Amino acid sequence: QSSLKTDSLSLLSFKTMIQDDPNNILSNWSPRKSPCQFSGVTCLGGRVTEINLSGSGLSGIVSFNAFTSLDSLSVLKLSENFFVLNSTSLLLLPLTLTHLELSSSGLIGTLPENFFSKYSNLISITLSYNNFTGKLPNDLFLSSKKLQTLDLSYNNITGPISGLTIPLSSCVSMTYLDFSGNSISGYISDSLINCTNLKSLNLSYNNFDGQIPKSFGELKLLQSLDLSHNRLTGWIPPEIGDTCRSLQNLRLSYNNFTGVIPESLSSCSWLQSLDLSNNNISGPFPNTILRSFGSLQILLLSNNLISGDFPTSISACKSLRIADFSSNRFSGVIPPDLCPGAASLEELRLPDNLVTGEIPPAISQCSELRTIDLSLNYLNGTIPPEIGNLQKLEQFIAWYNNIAGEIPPEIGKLQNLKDLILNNNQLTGEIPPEFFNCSNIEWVSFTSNRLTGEVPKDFGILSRLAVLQLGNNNFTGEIPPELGKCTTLVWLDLNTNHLTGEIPPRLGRQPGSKALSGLLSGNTMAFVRVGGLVEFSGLSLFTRYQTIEYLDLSYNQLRGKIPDEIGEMIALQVLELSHNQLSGEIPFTIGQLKNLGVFDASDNRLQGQIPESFSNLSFLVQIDLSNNELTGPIPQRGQLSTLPATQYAN
Ligand SMILES: *[C@@H]1O[C@H](CO[C@@H]2O[C@@H](C)[C@@H](O)[C@@H](O)[C@@H]2O)[C@@H](O[C@@H]2O[C@H](CO)[C@@H](O)[C@H](O)[C@H]2NC(C)=O)[C@H](O)[C@H]1NC(C)=O
Ligand SMILES: *[C@@H]1O[C@H](CO)[C@@H](O[C@@H]2O[C@H](CO)[C@@H](O)[C@H](O)[C@H]2NC(C)=O)[C@H](O)[C@H]1NC(C)=O
Ligand SMILES: *[C@@H]1O[C@H](CO)[C@@H](O)[C@H](O)[C@H]1NC(C)=O
Numbered sequence: 001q002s003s004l005k006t007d008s009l010s011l012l013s014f015k016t017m018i019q020d021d022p023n024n025i026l027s028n029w030s031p032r033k034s035p036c037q038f039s040g041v042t043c044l045g046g047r048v049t050e051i052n053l054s055g056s057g058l059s060g061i062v063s064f065n066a067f068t069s070l071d072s073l074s075v076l077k078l079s080e081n082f083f084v085l086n087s088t089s090l091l092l093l094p095l096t097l098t099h100l101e102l103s104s105s106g107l108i109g110t111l112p113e114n115f116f117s118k119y120s121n122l123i124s125i126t127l128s129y130n131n132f133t134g135k136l137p138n139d140l141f142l143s144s145k146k147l148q149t150l151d152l153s154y155n156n157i158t159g160p161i162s163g164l165t166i167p168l169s170s171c172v173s174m175t176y177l178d179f180s181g182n183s184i185s186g187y188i189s190d191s192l193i194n195c196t197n198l199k200s201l202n203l204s205y206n207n208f209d210g211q212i213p214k215s216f217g218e219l220k221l222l223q224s225l226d227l228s229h230n231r232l233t234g235w236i237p238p239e240i241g242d243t244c245r246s247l248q249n250l251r252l253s254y255n256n257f258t259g260v261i262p263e264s265l266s267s268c269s270w271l272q273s274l275d276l277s278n279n280n281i282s283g284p285f286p287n288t289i290l291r292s293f294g295s296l297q298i299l300l301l302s303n304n305l306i307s308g309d310f311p312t313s314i315s316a317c318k319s320l321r322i323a324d325f326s327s328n329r330f331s332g333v334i335p336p337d338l339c340p341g342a343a344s345l346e347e348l349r350l351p352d353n354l355v356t357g358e359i360p361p362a363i364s365q366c367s368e369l370r371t372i373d374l375s376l377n378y379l380n381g382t383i384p385p386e387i388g389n390l391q392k393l394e395q396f397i398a399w400y401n402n403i404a405g406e407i408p409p410e411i412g413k414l415q416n417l418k419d420l421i422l423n424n425n426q427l428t429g430e431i432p433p434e435f436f437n438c439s440n441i442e443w444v445s446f447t448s449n450r451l452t453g454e455v456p457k458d459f460g461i462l463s464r465l466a467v468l469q470l471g472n473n474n475f476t477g478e479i480p481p482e483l484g485k486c487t488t489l490v491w492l493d494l495n496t497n498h499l500t501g502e503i504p505p506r507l508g509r510q511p512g513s514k515a516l517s518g519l520l521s522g523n524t525m526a527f528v529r530v531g532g533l534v535e536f537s538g539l540s541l542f543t544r545y546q547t548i549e550y551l552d553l554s555y556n557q558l559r560g561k562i563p564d565e566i567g568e569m570i571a572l573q574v575l576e577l578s579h580n581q582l583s584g585e586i587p588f589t590i591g592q593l594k595n596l597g598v599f600d601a602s603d604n605r606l607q608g609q610i611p612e613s614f615s616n617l618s619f620l621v622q623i624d625l626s627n628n629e630l631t632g633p634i635p636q637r638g639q640l641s642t643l644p645a646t647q648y649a650n
């Protein structure tokens with residue numbers, strides 16, 4: 001009863017409602033032009049069928065009454081458009097609609113009744129990122145035989161789902177279902193079993209309580225289950241294994257699940273992602289499920305209570321790239337056969353466990369290892385020299401263990417090493433010379449070991465070193481002034497060693513300088529206002545004001561005066577030099593350290609008066625001038641007077 005006689009009129013009725021066309025999509029929407037050539041419109045057989053204005057950024061106050069007469073419209077894609085629209089307007093759409101994408105389209109209001117049960121030709125429904133407050137319509141699942149894809153994710157939908165009746169005969173096409181990002185409450189419905197062809201079910205980021213239903217085992221075709229970030233409790237039901245003929249992604253993280261990991265997951269030979277992290281899962285880890293996970297790429301178990309020996313069957317996971325056991329009760333040792341079994345292992349994380357034993361040298365045979373974290377365990381032995389074969393290793397983290405021996409010189413073969421964190425171990429010896437071929441190292445932490453020798457001068461050739469922590473060792477000698485060549489060092493910790501001599505004038509990143517290690521660090525470049533910036537042989541605002549920010553030198557045997565070049569480290573915030581043998585006056589340049597916040601110069605032998613330049617230290621919240629030989633009227637301007645008097649004793 002209509003033709004383009006009515007369709008072309010309908011499309012231009014929409015242009016009237018539009019009050020802003022940022023990209024001018026509706027520019028060619030003219031009655032002199034046919035709707036078949038209208039931007040974003042498609043016809044089949046002469047009548048309008050599709051109208052795609054998604055992402056166009058259109059802005060208006062629109063109503064869907066300008067589509068009703070379009071009784072040939074099968075696709076309606078108006079996603080990502082800044083126009084207001086009432087939720088009841090869904091009922092004014094053509095019943096010939098099959099696809100419907102209204103993501104971030106500006107819908108407001110509770111979902112209307114008699115829409116999902118009315119539009120019985122919709123196969124795909126995406127109404128995500130709107131404001132459908134309130135509950136779901138009772139008719140949501142009553143007559144949707146052909147609905148395959150229902151995405152109502154990321155609204156403010158509240159209320160329960162266990163009230164919705166789901167007839168077996170009306171949820172037969174449903175494969176993709178996404179209600180994530182809402183405030184839906186109550187127990188997970190046992191009725192979702194009736195959607196027998198579910199392949200993807202996502203209910204993450206809601207307020208579901210109660211247990212994972214045993215009925216979910218009946219979703220034989222399920223490939224992807226995400227119940228994460230809810231309040232689900234209880235044991236992971238073993239029936240879930242009855243979906244293992246299809247399951248590829250299982251996400252139960254951020255709930256409060258107790259009990260053991262079900263052994264039935266040993267049949268999930270197609271599993272690719274397993275995230276049980278951030279629960280209270282406990283009990284002996286069933287090693288046998290790992291022998292079936294030949295296709296597993298991601299294993300997230302962190303932040304649980306999982307006990308038992310660290311699983312030795314992890315060598316069967318030939319596809320595993322990420323293995324995260326952080327914060328569990330794993331005992332035993334690191335399996336020596338982990339490698340080359342886990343041939344694609346890239347991140348091995350098991351900090352905060354009860355794992356003992358040595359680091360197996362075979363771990364060098366996991367060729368793809370990028371990150372190793374073994375901290376807060378009970379490991380012994382020595383760092384195997386074979387560790388230098390992990391050419392792709394960027395993090396070796398193993399602080400708070402009982403590792404002994406010397407630092408193997410083979411570490412210099414790690415050209416990609418960026419973080420070497422070994423503090424609170426029992427490493428002895430001198431820092432090997434070959435260690436300094438790690439030119440890309442950014443964070444070195446040797447705190448609280450038994451290292452001896454002197455701080456090597458070759459710490460200056462490391463142009464990317466940002467944090468250096470050597471505190472509480474048996475280092476001797478003088479502070480190498482080469483440390484002042486580091487163009488990026490901003491944190492220096494040498495406290496509690498047997499270091500003598502003076503304090504070098506310039507240390508760490510100096511005013512100016514930049515991380516760049518090529519031509520852009522020199523000045524051979526030229527400005528030519530075919531170029532603009534050329535390398536003729538013979539910028540960096542803000543960053544040229546960066547310098548050391550944390551300098552702890554306390555509890556050593558240093559002598560001499562405090563240099564006045566330390567006043568040029570404007571970005572300094574913490575300056576702890578207490579318990580040395582320093583003398584002389586306090587430089588007036590200290591007042592230039594505006595952002596200084598901590599100044600611990602106790603148990604030295606300083607003399608003179610305190611410069612009133614300290615008044616400019618607006619951010620000084622802690623000072624400590626105990627056990628010195630100072631004298632004079634303490635500058636009352638600033639915070640120095642607001643600080644306690646015990647910081648000026650003796
Ligand atoms: C590194 O330590 C292991 C730790 O083994 C046991 O576990 C600890 C929690 C603690 O109770 C230790 O005293 C235990 O020994 C040592 O492994 C033992 O090694 C001895 C031989 O020296 C052997 O007879 C034990 O059976 C081993 N125990 C095991 C495997 O549980 C290991 O010797 C230590 N390595 C080094 C190089 O000192
Ligand atoms: C289930 O829903 C979420 C909703 O966001 C999907 O998106 C990812 O989920 C994480 C969970 O922390 C969000 O923070 C991220 O924004 C999303 N990450 C991406 C797209 O990489 C999530 O993927 C869905 N899960 C499954 C198994 O389909
Ligand atoms: C599935 O639907 C049938 C009718 O189609 C109904 O009898 C049954 O109770 C439903 N199952 C649920 C709600 O778990």
Ligand SMILES: *[C@@H]1O[C@H](CO)[C@@H](O)[C@H](O)[C@H]1NC(C)=O
Nearest residue numbers: 231233255256257258279280
């Ligand atoms: C989670 O389970 C643990 C272990 O049984 C329990 O102590 C805790 O109270 C639970 N937390 C919540 C938030 O339900």
Ligand SMILES: *[C@@H]1O[C@H](CO)[C@@H](O)[C@H](O)[C@H]1NC(C)=O
Nearest residue numbers: 256278279280303304305327
């Ligand atoms: C176990 O429940 C406690 C209860 O407070 C919660 O803090 C914690 O997240 C859960 N366990 C872990 C390991 O996260």
Ligand SMILES: *[C@@H]1O[C@H](CO)[C@@H](O)[C@H](O)[C@H]1NC(C)=O
Nearest residue numbers: 412413415434435436437438
């Ligand atoms: C880095 O230094 C070590 C020791 O001198 C050497 O074996 C290694 O080959 C050097 N660099 C590279 C890229 O191999």
